[PDB]
Symmetry: D2
Subunit: 364 residues, 4 copies
């Protein structure tokens, strides 16, 4: 460990990893501190859908940033693979947003006008995925709402960063950021470090730093419980989606299935009721999944915010301190765009101003 770095990233989930990579690409002398292991928390629980077309939202700055981050994924695997040897495991099968009611059709067809989205009838869906529940009314088909394996996106980024010269310290919690001196300094159990810039990327645990730094931004965990099966019997290429729940086909023959929404619950292992409700929901979407062998079960804490958007930007009173946290259901999608934005801000480059405003810290 050195005394000084030009930039310091606090937290080693996917968000922190992207930032570290993107700073090291700019040849900034960078260090990242992580409590446990890289990707060991909410990043590991994640399904890895790169879904910008959710929750079929309004067309705002949040959506453009999503579409943009989705674009940045196009050569990302190849880019990071060349430097890290780590494959992010990209699957380009696409997505069916299923409908089970007339009200479902109606709401989904409010997107048909986007060029990426077309509408399929009951018959047209089943032509492509015969095992989709027979009770469906049709589906929104999205070509670009693909997926990746979040753990490995995280490992590709951090490995790539190391190779570009970044310093990674696992098992090193940051206890405090200060704040007063000419330079910033951070305290660890292995002693202190000085920095020209500090990025807080500690997901749902980021409140500590906000408060240490005179800010009242709070985070609310929303726990999500998932499970996986082995699909040894059925063809399934497209991700099936309904009402925030999903069945995601992996390149291994596993299906990733989720998920519960449990606000205020900080626990990181599934309880019995959670898994039960996930299993019940999955069968309505793909009946054949009931005969599939269970593989793993797990949970993770989505980092919730008061308005549901992340905080990505400078401390309103100190340009040296940045935050990148609060990616609720979409931290995997947004990881590259978050990483690029943070890096550009630190380099004093000019950034999209709608994005700066949307994810600013001081939102009154």
């Amino acid at each position: 460990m050195k005394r000084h770095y030009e930039a310091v990233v606090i937290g080693g989930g996917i968000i922190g990893s992207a930032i570290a990579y993107y700073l090291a690409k700019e040849n900034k002398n960078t260090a990242l501190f992580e409590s446990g292991t890289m990707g060991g928390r909410t990043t590991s629980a994640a399904a890895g859908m790169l879904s910008a077309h959710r929750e079929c939202e309004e067309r705002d700055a949040f959506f453009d940033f999503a579409m943009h981050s989705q674009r940045l994924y196009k050569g990302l695997g190849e880019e990071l693979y060349a430097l890290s040897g780590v494959d992010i495991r990209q699957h380009n099968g696409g997505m069916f947003k299923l409908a089970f009611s007339e009200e479902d059709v109606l709401q989904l067809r409010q997107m048909d006008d986007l060029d990426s989205v077309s509408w399929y009838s009951k018959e047209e869906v089943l032509e492509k995925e015969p095992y989709a529940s027979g009770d469906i009314f049709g589906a929104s088909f999205i070509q670009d709402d693909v997926h990746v394996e979040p753990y490995f996106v995280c490992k590709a980024y951090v490995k790539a960063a190391k190779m570009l010269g970044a310093e990674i310290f696992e098992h090193t919690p940051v206890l405090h950021v200060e704040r007063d001196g000419e330079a910033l300094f951070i305290k660890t159990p292995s002693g202190d470090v000085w920095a020209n810039h500090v990025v807080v990327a500690s997901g749902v645990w980021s409140g500590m730093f906000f408060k240490q730094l005179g800010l009242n931004n709070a985070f609310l965990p929303v726990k999500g419980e998932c499970l996986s099966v082995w699909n040894d019997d059925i063809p399934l290429t497209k991700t099936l989606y309904h009402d925030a729940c999903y069945i995601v086909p992996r390149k291994s023959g596993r299906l990733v299935v989720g998920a519960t929404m449990k606000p205020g619950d900080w626990s990181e292992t599934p309880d019995l009721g959670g898994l039960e409700s996930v299993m019940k929901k999955a069968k309505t979407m793909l009946p054949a999944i009931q005969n599939m062998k269970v593989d793993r079960f797990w949970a993770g804490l989505r980092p919730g915010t008061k308005d549901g958007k992340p905080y990505i930007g400078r401390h309103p009173e100190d340009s040296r301190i940045l935050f990148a946290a609060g990616h609720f259901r979409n931290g995997i999608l947004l990881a590259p765009a978050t990483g690029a934005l943070i890096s550009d801000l630190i380099m004093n480059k000019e950034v999209n101003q709608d994005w700066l405003h949307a994810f600013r810290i001081d939102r009154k």
Copy 2:
């Protein structure tokens, strides 16, 4: 691995392990052959309740079960002395819950028994305050205890080993040959002579029956299970209802099961099966919703035409014995099964009702 043994045991689940111990205890130069690892199959999937009181009619089967339940009395200490292995015995007891009047009536027929009592809703809820508030009371059975089946199995085999028995894991027996003055079996590592052969291969035993001119068939009844951590509530007694159960282990885990899928040979749980085990558990113990899941698993109960095991001699050849088909009660029945098979080999006198009830040629 020798050329000859006095006795060969084929299969190292709880049953085969037991037989081998009783044989070794009698100074019979004994070998055991197991395809995989000791206890690695159905034995591993079992909850380990010693429940004889399962009513319906009190026949030969019932006596044998009660006799075996008695045999578990000093077993733990006995095997621990020889093996260093704890069978993890738990003396809490069992409540067989009632959810209807029909339930109450059927359970009250065991009342005459000394080991059984009826409890009312209010009396059950004093003892287990977290049992479902929908219960109409429960049959309490103080002596229907539980063990950890894997460790009973490991205890026995390690004991037999200390008594001289030779154990061969990763050694499938391919054929038993009956023709000559002595028996022999075939394995991939060579062929071994024997004076007695015991077939203890659980649901896979059919292979050998057929080889030896008998048409005895086994049907697997797959059972899926899960465990949760009970970190929050007191629960001393096993809860039971309609063949499902919640069993508190001395680790703080709860063992919960089980499905019943006949004709399925798969040994890992399906999603639908695990879903129904969770549904059922919640009806017995509502708080189970909020307990963190630990593990999920499955195994194959060895079913037979009439529900009863085959324990005894080949009707044409007293050198050959079978010990397979302990449906929902293989753990309970293992000590008595072991002692019976051993006694028969040794030509001792045995209960002739038990001999008749578990015989090979039935119709």
Copy 3:
């Protein structure tokens, strides 16, 4: 989660769990906060030997260790009654082997002790025939037993819970604030007042010392371990030598360790470390070569400047107590640690030598 507790315990390893039980036993309205899961850290990685006889000099530390070893006497039954959790106690005892004359000499200095005897090569090999044939004999210590540390931890916490203590997993404490008429701590889920705060955060305790104007430092000494299945040989006693050990569990597993890597904060084993644990084990028990590996793991021993824990009051503030830095002996010391912290809070009189040896301001 309430606004106020009489006592708050920060950390749920074996130590914090113990403290919480003793506090709850005294009817103190008690809360415990743990970052992860109860016992999920160093406590989980510990072998669980109760070894006080570790010579060198017999000081205050030694008495305390012996006192704690006495406290384990009815503990298992005591905690089982309240919790339903078995601490998995094993009374086999320990051989501290000798491989040289230097070895013999150093070990023979404990001879005067009543709980200790010397055995010759031939006497050790009668008892444990598989111990290395290179031994020059061993110090036998009948009462240096072992437990399963995770379950001692779970036993205590579940007991405290049954006595009224409120437990909060997944709840890191971020700050202790000292300024006002009463203490408070800060958590992500809100802030809580307290009359006493106990810091029991193992190797991570430094955070709090600093916050509270004290410069006490912790150095982790990582220890890597493995387990094998002993399916083939008798082994009742623990084997010990030069801080490495082989411990037989009542499951049939052997627990083997350990490395000593100071300044390493990683909690999973490296390859080099596991290689050296295997090398060492084989020198003590050659047959271990042929035993199938089960698991490998690691944890961080909480080291201090002088090797001793800090157990006691903030020298400036009697509302604040510390219980951290039990280097190689946190499991052994947990009952006495729990009773000491509890007694201090309750203002009872305590051994003043022990109070002095484990005090916070040392130099």
Copy 4:
């Protein structure tokens, strides 16, 4: 389960799976029986090196068949991915066959003349892999000795086969093959099945069937113990090889490390001495591996034969019965060629005759 199939494959390792796929491609009504799960035995233990240039052998029929099977891998992933959704996880990093002595150099340079093999000096190796042991004398570099994940090759094949119409029955041991009737029939615990052709592909357990069928072909298990680490710190693209031991970099950042040779040992979990010796050997090849975190440990039974080559072909007295078993250290490499050969023989196509002879059952 049906009464009759045109062909029946006994055993569901990689060999059996390839055969099932290749028969189903020819639209033969096919069934495969497996005791446990697909790929659950020796196929799962395997490293997945597709190495034809071992043990730097003589240039014979065995070698050509290997080179050929290696060629068949070129579009195999894409071929099977289109039908199964399962990625075989192909890595094209290549191989260094390291030398630690003058005798090592000498023996390795007996291959320089092959166009696929060039020689690197100590310096040239370290230029590419700085972490290779400094005690090396140089290395044979092989561009095409790539690798795959054997479990998934096996799953891709079996899934592809199902889609082509094949019937897969896991948890169904074959008890007996007979033999006498007009048609062949096999006995399972779920009852009997008739077949026009029977393929024995039961790896190291195949002796049973040879003997049931009047043949004395024996198999000797050679147990192999392996472990994996996480390489989070070091660049490593090339497989390192020395004296039958190996460090294989996976696309996940794991390194696969092996292996012991234990003849006559039928056990399928590592013992302590085995793993110790694997760890000791690995450090001499890549010193930095000693600081790497352990992940998994496992073992498998190589299916040995009297002469070290497999048996791939017809029963010398019955054209309806075939065997494909005894791929010692190279079943993953040879899986496609074995599958193609068996299928062609069953279809009475004309096959390479040197290959037929080399792997014939009756080798006196």
